[PDB]
Paper text:
KCR channelrhodopsins (K+-selective light-gated ion channels) have received attention as potential inhibitory optogenetic tools but more broadly pose a fundamental mystery regarding how their K+ selectivity is achieved. Structural, electrophysiological, computational, spectroscopic, and biochemical analyses reveal a distinctive mechanism for K+ selectivity; rather than forming the symmetrical filter of canonical K+ channels achieving both selectivity and dehydration, instead, three extracellular-vestibule residues within each monomer form a flexible asymmetric selectivity gate, while a distinct dehydration pathway extends intracellularly.
We expressed HcKCR1 and HcKCR2 in Sf9 insect cells and reconstituted purified proteins into lipid nanodiscs (STAR Methods); cryo-EM structures in the dark state were resolved at 2.6 and 2.5 Å, respectively. However, we noted three key differences in HcKCRs: (1) K84 points toward the extracellular side, (2) no water molecules are observed between the Schiff base proton and the two aspartates (D105 and D229), and (3) the highly conserved arginine on ECL1 (R112 in ChRmine) is replaced by a tryptophan (W102 in HcKCRs). We found that the ion passes between N99, W102, and Y222, which we refer to as the selectivity triad, and then enters the extracellular vestibule with minimal protein distortion. In WT HcKCR1, we noticed that the selectivity triad stochastically deviated from the cryo-EM conformation, adopting a more open structure with Y222 rotating away from W102. We refer to the Y222 conformation similar to that of the cryo-EM structure as conformation 1 (tight) and the Y222 conformation positioned farther from W102 as conformation 2 (loose). WT simulations suggested that when Y222 adopts the loose conformation, the triad architecture becomes significantly opened, transiently reducing channel selectivity.
Author numbering:
A (entry chain A), B (entry chain A), C (entry chain A): 6 to 260
Write the structure that this text describes.
């Protein structure tokens, strides 16, 4: 991909590769670290009290928050190696925008859906999956059909966002107030930050032209830290509060 | 992919791109529309009587018919954008024949297998998956090993077709006559149309040479409409008849 | 991929393609054959006595050993067609080292994990998946970041190997001595041979330079025969011994 004489001067690929490499490297360590904390604490037991799991194992699906973090962090390690190697390398996760997200965003929606017991888990998964594929297509397409792909993207996303809103709202009163606190912050992230991604696309170098490819890399690093690690920690703490109420103390869910 | 001077005149890629774009666009709307009807009716309740689901949710796997339709329709939107953009675009679902089917055909077999309660669901899934990958390989390979890939394809498909025949036949008498009617039409499609795909490959421009790449695109649009939408509607109506008998009226399956 | 004038003389791709084709072809037949035996015997019933399954079906997950074999054998058929066609063909499973393993190795770990009832099945799956992706990246990367990808690979693999060791050791005394015999050989393969793959990478033409690309193809054919077929047969016989004890004879697991 990289011209043997380096990227052209005025090229969108004429970036500060050392800085980009560095930023991915730190993001790699914090996101992966958060995942290790998540799996560790999950194994410790149920609730803050750390009541022993009857089976001696946590439920399989509780592992998704941590796994998503370890997977996102591993991709940030790859992304770093590409930047430090100057970009345009044979195995570049920095070349096809959104391809990495095809793997992590559908897992995030499942994690949220198992944690709250939302209906229509298969639908939510495919809604998210198709949305990210439209993004990928949108980014590689140089014609105006760029915006045909983007719109097709928005067609999937909008009914997904509104459906999820209604479903979370229905379950938000089932949980006790202590649980309700963590659920609030996770909703802020989901409904605050997920819309940021398509709004950013419009102002990028592929739309209006306000945001450079370099700034775009740095911004997605902050967004990935928030949408994976912090969200992950919020799901973990939400599940600890929930277990303390229902399992350690034996109380019942409003429902 | 597209030469800057357009496709050569005698080229297999010298096609009526406006017509192809148009045809994919209509197929996109009908297939996606059918899927929306499928998920809507599923949510309404069990049977024609629309008896409330006890849990308040349909079973997850009942969503596959509709999902398959929404996924196939979304790919027909992509295929349209590629044709209208003249073909050979960076994100072309019209370039690698059969790649799209790698995602939808294994889902169709699961849908049919959950609906009838066939054995060996994991086997059926991988049988179908491998068959379509052989097709993909067959299409990109320009040598005579084209027919080595095709044969390897047929090796997977033939024992799958015969195994399924036997398994459907065993379950066809379990169901009441009203159900038996819909099951018949779905079998016609599965055993009539699925064989059409490999028979078409032989007469294509990659075999004998009777069918042009353009005609081939138009024919697969009709086959996708039949194998996804109509099949989908037949599964839906079959499940409505079945639920009316077993759930609303409480009758028992012959079995 | 292949220069129209053939591969250069001193090229790593100047190989004995007839011999390579031949070797893949035999490996294809034995691995696929073993899989057919595996599914056949599974269908026969529970234990050596072949006690009828109550449901009339084997459990779905017992099919994985055979499926993995049929999938690996099918890829060896593809690999053969590529070698006989001289290499560098459009659908070459011989071009991107380790890509094929991305599909089979995570399935092997699930098969082993369902058979022994190991905890953390989702974690084990993703540990293996990410490791093989690091291999793929390592192989295509020509820079020294080759060894950054390899190390990242080893970061996933090492905690996986040690975790599995501890978990198998905990379950190895649950099973009766007759079962314990087969479990021993399967552990030899898993802990003997899986480490062979990264040790080979170091001595290859991409590391020190002791092992040629040709020898490397032949060695992986022997390793795939051992890690898929023989392992597969060991899992099958282990499950037959186990069922004879617990199901046919009704005895209890130490646990
Ligand atoms: C930052 C997000 C804010 C969440 C704070 C939740 C909180 O308040 O934490 C409390 C304790 O949670 C707990 O066990 C612990 C909560 C924090 C979990 C620790 C985060 C680990 C970060 C690892 C990064 C390492 C990088 C190398 C919950 O009861 P107050
Ligand atoms: C794409 C959709 C992904 C998730 C769809 C889903 O799971 O939502 C189902 C359909 O609701 C819905 O789409 C209804 C809400 C979203 C559709 C709104 C369209 C406005 C444009 C929920 O049905 P209920 O449980 O109410 O019965
Ligand atoms: C065409 C296939 C033939 C199937 C007809 C089944 C039938 O006979 O439909 C009846 C009613 O089914 C039902 O609820 C409804 C059956 C038909 C379902 C409606 C199809 C929706 C098409 C959406 C396309 C919109 C494009 C934008 C079944 O009891 P008779
Ligand atoms: C590829 C196979 C995909 C599905 C295989 C499967 O699920 O079929 C199983 C094997 O039957 C079979 O292949 C037997 C029928 C298909 C094989 C016929 C080979 C003829 C050439 C069914 O076993 P049963 O329930 O009778 O015990
Ligand atoms: C070689 C691995 C060694 C395992 C031998 C296990 C053994 O000892 O086999 C015995 C019987 O197992 C059984 O039913 C049969 C055990 C062997 C299974 C037969 C292997 C089939 C190979 C198919 C390859 C065909 C290629 C075309 C187990 O009780 P002893
Ligand atoms: C990557 C990890 C894949 C599998 C991880 C897993 O499933 O292992 C869990 C964590 O143990 C572990 O990693 C502990 C053993 C592996 C970590 C050792 C690190 C040394 C370097 C097991 O937890 P327990 O059941 O003891 O509670
Ligand atoms: C961890 C990364 C996350 C949560 C990413 C989410 C990304 C989106 C919600 C992206 C949405 C898009 C559209 C709605 C349409 C156009 C293309 C996208 C991918 C930017
Ligand atoms: C919705 C699309 C469907 C149901 C497609 C099915 C396609 C096949 C059954 C194709 C079969 C093939 C072979 C049996 C061998 C050669 C290659 C194929 C893919 C044409
Ligand atoms: C059937 C094939 C099997 C069991 C292959 C297993 C392969 C590995 C365990 C490979 C391991 C690697 C590393 C630990 C790091 C570097 C890259 C690999 C893929 C060679
Ligand atoms: C929905 C409307 C936005 C799509 C814009 C792309 C137009 C496609 C035609 C380009 C010539
Ligand atoms: C109570 C703390 C809430 C967590 C922080 C909210 C998420 C936004 C981070 C940027
Ligand atoms: C929904 C469809 C969105 C299409 C318009 C996006 C913004 C276009 C930016 C200007 C391009 C010059
Ligand atoms: C979200 C953060 C707001 C976007 C940052 C502005 C882009 C900076 C200019 C890059 C050229
Ligand atoms: C927090 C958001 C980070 C903003 C990134 C802007 C960098 C511009 C070069
Ligand atoms: C099964 C027979 C059909 C395969 C035909 C391809 C032959 C491969 C050799 C080409 C030279
Ligand atoms: C009773 C109606 C049956 C449905 C139609 C059969 C499928 C063939 C369509 C072309
Ligand atoms: C089963 C193997 C099928 C191989 C033959 C397919 C038809 C070949 C068409 C003629 C090619 C000139
Ligand atoms: C199934 C429909 C039958 C095939 C159609 C014949 C192909 C038309 C000729 C294209 C050149
Ligand atoms: C119904 C089948 C459609 C036949 C397509 C033939 C088109 C030839 C140009
Ligand atoms: C862990 C250490 C091994 C990694 C070796 C690759 C070094 C990357 C820098 C190359 C210049
Ligand atoms: C763990 C990191 C391994 C890095 C070193 C691998 C061997 C390098 C081979 C010599 C290369 C000339
Ligand atoms: C495992 C087998 C040991 C490796 C074989 C040595 C490589 C032969 C030399 C190739 C040039
Ligand atoms: C058994 C291992 C096979 C060794 C392969 C070495 C081949 C060298 C040419």
């Amino acid at each position: 991909s990289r011209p043997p004489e380096g990227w052209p001067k005025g090229s969108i690929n004429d970036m500060d590769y050392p800085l980009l490499g560095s930023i991915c490297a730190v993001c790699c360590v914090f996101v992966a670290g958060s995942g290790i904390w998540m799996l560790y604490r999950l194994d410790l037991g149920m609730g803050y009290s750390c009541k022993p799991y009857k089976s001696g194992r946590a439920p399989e699906v509780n592992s998704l928050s941590g796994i998503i973090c370890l997977l996102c962090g591993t991709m940030y390690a790859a992304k770093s190696f590409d930047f430090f190697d100057g970009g345009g390398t044979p195995f570049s996760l920095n070349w096809y925008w959104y391809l990495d997200y095809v793997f992590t965003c559908p897992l995030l929606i499942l994690d949220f859906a198992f944690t709250l017991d939302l209906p229509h888990k298969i639908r939510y998964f495919f809604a998210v999956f198709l949305t990210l594929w439209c993004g990928v297509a949108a980014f590689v397409t140089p014609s105006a059909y760029r915006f045909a792909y983007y719109a097709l993207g928005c067609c999937w996303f909008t009914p997904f966002a509104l459906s999820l809103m209604r479903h979370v709202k229905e379950r938000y009163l089932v949980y006790p107030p202590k649980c309700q606190r963590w659920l609030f912050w996770a909703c802020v992230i989901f409904f605050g930050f997920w819309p940021m991604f398509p709004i950013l696309f419009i102002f990028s170098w592929l739309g209006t032209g306000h945001i450079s490819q370099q700034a775009f890399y740095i911004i997605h690093a902050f967004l990935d830290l928030t949408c994976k690690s912090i969200f992950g920690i919020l799901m973990t703490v939400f599940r600890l509060e929930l277990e303390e109420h229902t399992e350690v103390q034996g109380l019942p869910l409003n429902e």
